[PDB]
Amino acid sequence: AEIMKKTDFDKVASEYTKIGTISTTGEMSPLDAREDLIKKADEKGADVVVLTSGQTENKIHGTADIYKKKLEHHHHHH
Numbered sequence: 418a419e420i421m422k423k424t425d426f427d428k429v430a431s432e433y434t435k436i437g438t439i440s441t442t443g444e445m446s447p448l449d450a451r452e453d454l455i456k457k458a459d460e461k462g463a464d465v466v467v468l469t470s471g472q473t474e475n476k477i478h479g480t481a482d483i484y485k486k487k488l489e490h491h492h493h494h495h
Contacts, residue, residue: 418463418464418466420455420468421468432486433486433487434484434485435482435483436462436463436484437482438469440478444478447474454468454481458481461483462485467481467483469481
């Protein structure tokens with residue numbers, strides 16, 4: 418699982434699927450919150466962790482929507 422914001426993820430939103438929301442126990446540390454959310458997300462099998470709150474201690478608790486990628490199977494589309 419990787420850390421991106423909603424602004425970053427939005428561009429490729431239709432390529433992924435929301436499997437749930439993860440949350441840190443609280444606003445611990447900025448980079449540490451990321452790592453803890455990567456722990457949860459990757460444990461749930463998520464491809465992307467979408468910080469729907471932001472990062473860098475900017476009024477964040479640590480809520481992120483977890484998404485999985487749409488894996489393709491011979492459907493080349495031309």
